[PDB]
Design a protein around this ligand. Structure first.
Ligand SMILES: Nc1nc2c(ncn2[C@@H]2O[C@H](COP(=O)(O)OP(=O)(O)OP(=O)(O)O)[C@@H](O)[C@H]2O)c(=O)[nH]1
Ligand SMILES: Nc1nc2c(ncn2[C@@H]2O[C@H](COP(=O)(O)OP(=O)(O)OP(=O)(O)O)[C@@H](O)[C@H]2O)c(=O)[nH]1
Ligand SMILES: Nc1nc2c(ncn2[C@@H]2O[C@H](COP(=O)(O)OP(=O)(O)O)[C@@H](O)[C@H]2O)c(=O)[nH]1
Ligand SMILES: [Mg+2]
Ligand SMILES: [Mg+2]
Lengths: 28, 54, 46, 442, 57, 430, 442
């Protein structure tokens, strides 16, 4: 480890749903 | 006996709601046959009050 | 961040945390000088 | 003319569904595709303006926001046949609940969502020309209702200032209970609501269940019935703004007439012709019977007994076919009774209102059809007993710090419990002192 | 005060709250004035429809 | 609000296999993984336990770990085994040998990095992470040692989330292994520090439930694992369906635990009734509440009449009135007032959910926090002290490398847990 | 009347494709340069003349050149749908790219191609009778855009002199980045751009991504969306030259009104009704709402917060059905707000323009259809924060000469880094001095 914050690698995030959502039709 | 299962909101406030009027539908249903409706209004484009006479 | 998905939350102009920098709804504004007062007194002939 | 509705948390949104169902059915707002295909009133009138704004193409949209930290209930409103009404920005939902912790709602999670709510309320308040108040629905027993309700009323009170704020609040019942930490949340909520509210309406679920068991004939009531009763009360109070009448009453008149001192703003509410269809066809319902009915404790929607206190002011709203002479005869008969007592410093204890629009009947509803109704809001010293019982339950739990570690972990000092408990104790002393006669020896 | 009439000048600078009869330059006063003139026209129309049936002739 | 599952050891893998069958049935997912349901209410919360693969498919968010592949080959050979993602199966090359120290220190540290990499990879993909769910037995070897190792690592990496464990615990009479007291004591010592909430089941209680209530002539492990899957799927029901009074795992934890060490709970499920008998039962809320408090339906060997309830929670599934629930819980609190701790004014939380489990018109699951669990800990401490005073089998653990002071520390910490339960049991207002 | 467009590099050519698609669709020229043969309105209006010239057979050809050093993008224009619109001499392409090196574009490779560009611009300028400015589109982050854009602006500024030069420039976002050497190229570009440009408009990709996520409902935006928004803004700015209106604004009036001191010519841009079709049908969009909208930071296409600075001048362009009285009431209401501040030496902060032609709708577009829109360009001291972060990134990299050997090998002295960084330090000090409240009046 290069004197950093431990030899652990944090995986990324896939999706980020927001607060307000649309009311139009949604399909399966 | 348990084929039909509603939730309480749909049973009390919106009982006549068919499954075709909710946001989630299958991807093989026709959309042209459904009448258009995307807002709430007093009149249905009714001629008694909208027309301005002259 | 709070809204979610945005790169950064946009700044807000309407409100603020600091009570001495927020924008009140009821702006207490000035009346025009014309619509006040009495005006000229004008007499007819009896 | 205009009023803005703010719905917070679970009780406030569920009561909001019933309220907007009722106001839509009373005004005649329907699906645009669904033509009436039947006879209607057909009269173009401005009454909707209190609750709706027009886009100019003639669509109606309502003056409301729905606020919640858990998605389920708001996602449930986004999926029905009522999605077509609200503007999608109005339906705001967070990711995770405040888990019955006031500290979590106020400090950790509501602090992220609060700025969106104030921006939406400003966008609504900019589209008004005679705003005369906010109506707020929430329960003080839960975490998000207490924490976000307090934070939002504090911000509204700094930004909007003098404008009036009327709250409809569901308080924890005195022996029926749903969660263990209810006393802590209710005390900490009540501390904020004391400073930042103009009129507070008091509700107890046990009273509305007792009223639905005794007067209506329902053995197994559920929340939809209570919310429909609340919607009828709100419709009665706001009817004075929307329809013609003999004696109108603006929302500022409630605040001027019901509140004698700035801290004495907690009021009781009751409704008279709560009656079933089978009883309704056996009896006439004249003004004097319903006026006598509103003072019986079987008619009240809060579990308190007013015979153990003194009235300070009463505001009686009559709607439907009533004539002022009958109201005067009824009020004189009430004034004669010996079991109804007013503090001697309040000689003119009554304000009357008379409106011509009778209460609406909802197709799936349980109330009967009646030509007239009366609704009452009154200020009484009996309310001091509810706070005394909450404080005793708080003292029992707080003597051993039974659950404090959650609140201390979510960011709050232990000192804040003692401050709030002393402030509610001072409110109890205010109600003891105000009700003491200023008798002078001579 | 540079004005001949001091009371009017003093009253002019006093802030005001009434946004009714068209006096302000803000949007609220303009919208309200439009509402008032529209209401007057509508009321005259209804009254003429219900009493004066010989106006148009 | 999605849960991540971890299945460890033989007991954990078998209960997990039955659990994923029950959950897949409730959401109408075919054994090929294709959604074939008939209402949007089933689909609208499928994300909570399943991830979506391309073109309709769903994959279950679970990690399977075991030290010998025999169990893994058995679950993969099962009727729903194909649904599991192949890269999610982790196995070693030598058994746990029923020894906690080898399973925790020697093969544990060898495999733990690959399981933590997969668990972190799965958690960080979520938009908002709710707690983890773990199934394992405390009496075994790889279940206890590697389960508690993984629990400690996840508590280091995600300290702000909730940590939930489901654990099977040894009967006092039916031992399956001679060295159960050491593995159980060390595991309970690790859990009481790391866990936020832990649920316990006695195989003896499930045997008595099957024989007395269900009158099964020849019960099998599939029935016990079905009862466990029923309670496990009931606890999460309010997370994934609408209802008149929503509830959540964090809301349950905040209302159930008065003090951080008091987080061990008993479980029960009510509409249990044997086949054949013309009596139906469960057709109104009084019937469910009366059966709910019947000790025949409680999943621990300790009986409530020897202790007192600090708190309790009931989650109801079905279309029902709130008055029957509220008035029943008030009547039960008033009539049996001596068994409820008096310095709390109302001990029961209620919750109501609209969607019942398939094939039942209504159901309720009961969670209870009772001090009678102290008798079980006293029993484990007695058997541990009898074996430790005589060095009965310690050379295996010492040969793996453990210092005896870890055993004395774990015994002292468990004894202090028993003391804390006893002091809060006998507290008074004065 | 006439304006000449110069497109440089990849971003500038791709934004040019969207711009010419939009200008064609607004006038009605088919993609092959021929007017609709079947349409007979008869009033063959001259409005195209600002952007097109006629041969005599009635084909249209546009007043633009496309300049690039790599062939791929120009060959895409040559083989795409608009192949026949452009004159083949206008599409100029070199052999090899500037490889993110400003030195490679300016010293080594652009010096061979630059003389063809000046000959084409001369051939365009000879076919004009009222040329009133150049519009330039480029990015300062890449090598050929920086080096050849600077060299070409210097040569145009010496040869043509007083004629105005307006640049639309995409600056490096504060945390979004595409290449490592962006700070060096942006500093070296801005050094040349300071002396040889009359107005510079600043854009950040991070802002247009935020605007497309929050207001429009697009989950996965791509460069075509950003380029269509930029094209709409350019069409709004140039609409004042092409159609009838109540208050016209010539391109020299923008330059006269927006720049107070000769170095203070960097401006922010915003657009009001960026809205989705589902929200647009739920709300009316009157003048006062869009006027309040243009000042919210959620509407800007550059990532800066104006509350940390002061506005000096605003130019508001309204297009569509708007009436001057509503514009006057709106501007007076904006001026009343307390969180919007102007420097005290600029009392009359606003310039207004009102044009009747409404914005065009593009068949594959994502904006809704609206009857009116407003676009704003404003000068504010907040821009000083944008330069400080680029200068900080330059200082971090330059402390160790992290990549300088490429620039030194391709022909540039090491001294040029320090000179340019000192010039940007002086620009920062100019924005500090102009914004200081003078206390000499009191
Ligand atoms: N009248 C009425 N009371 C309700 C309703 N829903 C909940 N309550 C009562 O309000 C209290 C619970 O408050 P909640 O609204 O659930 O709390 P919350 O606002 O959801 O806060 P969180 O749990 O953190 O999300 C209990 O006393 C319930 O009996 C309702 O729909 N109508
Ligand atoms: N808005 C927008 N930005 C773009 C586009 N294409 C590239 N950019 C941005 O511009 C910068 C890259 O500049 P380029 O145009 O690729 O540089 P160049 O002109 O090709 O210079 P060379 O690489 O030497 O050929 C980065 O910040 C990109 O994000 C585009 O189509 N639209
Ligand atoms: N309920 C249940 N208990 C089990 C199951 N398999 C094993 N057990 C119990 O768990 C204990 C044995 O632990 P085990 O899983 O073999 O430990 P391991 O060797 O470390 O995997 C005994 O009490 C068994 O009765 C199962 O499928 N269901
Ligand atoms: Mg809630
Ligand atoms: Mg390039």
């Amino acid at each position: 480890p290069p004197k950093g914050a431990t030899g652990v690698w944090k995986p990324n995030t896939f999706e980020c749903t927001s607060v307000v959502q649309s009311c139009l039709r949604r399909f399966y | 006996v348990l084929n039909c299962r509603p939730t309480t909101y749909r049973r009390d406030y919106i009982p006549t709601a068919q499954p075709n009027e909710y946001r989630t539908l299958s991807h093989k249903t026709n959309l042209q046959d459904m009448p258009p409706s995307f807002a709430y209004s007093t009149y249905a484009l009714d001629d008694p009050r909208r027309i301005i006479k002259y | 961040s709070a809204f979610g998905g945005l790169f950064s939350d946009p700044p807000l102009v309407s409100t603020d945390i600091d009570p001495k920098k927020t924008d009140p709804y009821d702006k207490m504004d000035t009346i025009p000088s014309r619509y006040l007062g009495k005006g000229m007194s004008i007499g007819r002939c009896p | 003319r205009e009023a803005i509705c703010i719905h917070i948390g679970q009780a406030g949104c569920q009561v909001g569904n019933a309220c907007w169902e009722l106001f839509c059915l009373e005004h005649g707002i329907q699906p645009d595709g669904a033509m009436p295909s039947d006879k209607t009133i057909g009269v173009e009138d401005d009454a909707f303006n209190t609750f709706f704004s027009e886009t100019g193409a003639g669509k109606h949209v309502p003056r409301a926001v729905f606020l919640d930290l858990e998605p389920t209930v708001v996602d449930e409103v986004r999926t029905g046949t009522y999605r077509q009404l609200f503007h999608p920005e109005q339906l705001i939902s967070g990711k995770e609940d405040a888990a019955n912790n006031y500290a979590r709602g106020h400090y950790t999670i509501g602090k992220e969502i609060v700025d969106l709510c104030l921006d939406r309320i400003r966008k609504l308040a900019d589209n008004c020309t005679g705003l005369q108040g906010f109506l707020v629905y929430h329960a003080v027993g839960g975490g998000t209702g207490s924490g976000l309700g307090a934070l939002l009323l504090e911000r509204l009170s700094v930004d909007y200032g003098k404008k009036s704020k009327l709250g409809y609040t569901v308080y924890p019942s005195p022996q029926v209970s749903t969660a263990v930490v209810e006393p802590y949340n209710s005390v900490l909520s009540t501390h904020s609501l004391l400073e930042h509210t103009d009129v507070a309406a008091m509700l107890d679920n046990e009273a509305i269940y007792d009223l639905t068991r005794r007067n209506l004939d329902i053995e197994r009531p559920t929340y939809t019935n209570l919310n429909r009763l609340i919607g009828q009360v709100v419709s009665s109070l706001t009817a004075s703004l929307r329809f013609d009448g003999a004696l109108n009453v603006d929302l500022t008149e409630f605040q001027t007439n019901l509140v004698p001192y700035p801290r004495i703003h907690f009021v009781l509410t009751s409704y008279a012709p709560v009656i079933s269809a089978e009883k309704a066809y056996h009896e006439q319902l004249s003004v004097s019977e319903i006026s006598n009915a509103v003072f019986e404790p079987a008619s009240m929607m809060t579990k308190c007994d007013p015979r153990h206190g003194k009235y300070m002011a009463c505001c009686l709203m009559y709607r439907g076919d009533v004539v002022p002479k009958d109201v005067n005869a009824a009020v004189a008969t009430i004034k004669t009774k010996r079991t109804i007592q007013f503090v001697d410093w309040s000689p003119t204890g009554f304000k009357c209102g008379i409106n011509y629009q009778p209460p609406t009947v909802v197709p799936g509803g349980d109330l009967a059809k009646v030509q007239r109704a009366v609704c009452m809001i009154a200020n009484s010293t009996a309310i001091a007993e509810v706070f005394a019982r909450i404080d005793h339950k708080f003292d029992l739990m707080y003597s051993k710090r039974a659950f404090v570690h959650w609140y201390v972990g979510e960011g709050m000092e232990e000192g804040e419990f003692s401050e709030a408990r002393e402030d509610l104790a001072a409110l109890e002393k205010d109600y003891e002192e105000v009700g003491a006669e200023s008798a002078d020896m001579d | 005060c540079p004005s001949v009439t001091p009371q009017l000048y003093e009253k002019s600078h006093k802030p005001s709250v009434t946004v009714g009869m068209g006096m302000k330059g803000s949007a609220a006063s303009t919208a309200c004035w439009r509402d008032q003139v529209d209401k007057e026209e509508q009321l005259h129309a209804i009254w003429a429809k219900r009493y004066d049936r010989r106006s148009n002739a | 609000r999605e849960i991540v599952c971890v299945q460890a050891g033989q007991c954990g893998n078998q209960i997990g296999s039955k659990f994923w069958e029950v959950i897949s049935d409730e959401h109408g997912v075919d054994p090929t993984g294709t959604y074939q349901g008939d209402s949007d209410l089933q689909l609208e919360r499928i994300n909570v336990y399943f991830d979506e693969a391309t073109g309709g498919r769903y994959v279950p968010r679970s990690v399977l770990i075991d030290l010998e592949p025999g169990t893994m080959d058995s679950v993969r050979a099962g009727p729903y085994g194909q649904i599991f993602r192949p890269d999610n199966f982790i196995f070693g090359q030598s058994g746990a040998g029923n020894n906690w120290a080898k399973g925790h220190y020697t093969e544990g540290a060898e495999l733990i990095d690959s399981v933590l990499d997969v668990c972190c990879k799965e958690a960080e993909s979520c938009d908002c992470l709710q707690g983890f769910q773990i199934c394992h037995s405390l009496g075994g070897g790889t279940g206890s040692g590697m389960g508690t190792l993984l629990i400690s690592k996840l508590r280091e990496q995600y300290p702000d989330r909730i940590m939930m464990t489901f654990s099977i615990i040894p009967s006092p009479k039916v031992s399956d292994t001679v060295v159960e007291p050491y593995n159980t004591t060390l595991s309970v010592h690790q859990l009481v520090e790391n866990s936020d909430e832990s649920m316990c089941i006695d195989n003896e209680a499930l045997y008595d439930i099957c024989f007395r209530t269900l009158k099964l002539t020849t019960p099998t492990f599939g029935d016990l694992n079905h009862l466990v899957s029923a309670v496990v799927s009931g606890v999460t029901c309010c997370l994934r369906f609408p209802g008149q009074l929503n509830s959540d795992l964090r809301k349950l934890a905040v209302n159930l635990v008065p003090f951080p060490r008091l987080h061990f709970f008993m479980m029960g499920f009510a509409p249990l009734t044997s086949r054949g008998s013309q009596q139906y039962r469960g057709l109104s809320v009084p019937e469910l509440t009366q059966q709910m408090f019947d000790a025949k339906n409680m999943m621990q060997a300790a009986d409530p009449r020897h202790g007192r309830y600090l708190t309790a929670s009931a989650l109801f599934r079905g279309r029902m009135s709130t008055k029957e629930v509220d008035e029943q819980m008030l009547n039960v609190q008033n009539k049996n007032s001596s068994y409820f701790i008096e310095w709390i004014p109302n001990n029961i939380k209620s919750s109501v959910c609209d969607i019942p489990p398939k094939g039942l018109k209504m159901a309720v699951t009961f969670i209870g926090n009772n001090t009678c669990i102290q008798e079980m800990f006293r029993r484990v401490g007695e058997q541990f002290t009898l074996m430790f005073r005589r060095k009965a089998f310690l050379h295996w653990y010492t040969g793996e490398g453990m210092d005896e002071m870890e055993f004395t520390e774990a015994e002292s910490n468990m004894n202090d847990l028993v003391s804390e339960y006893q002091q809060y049991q006998d507290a008074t207002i004065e």
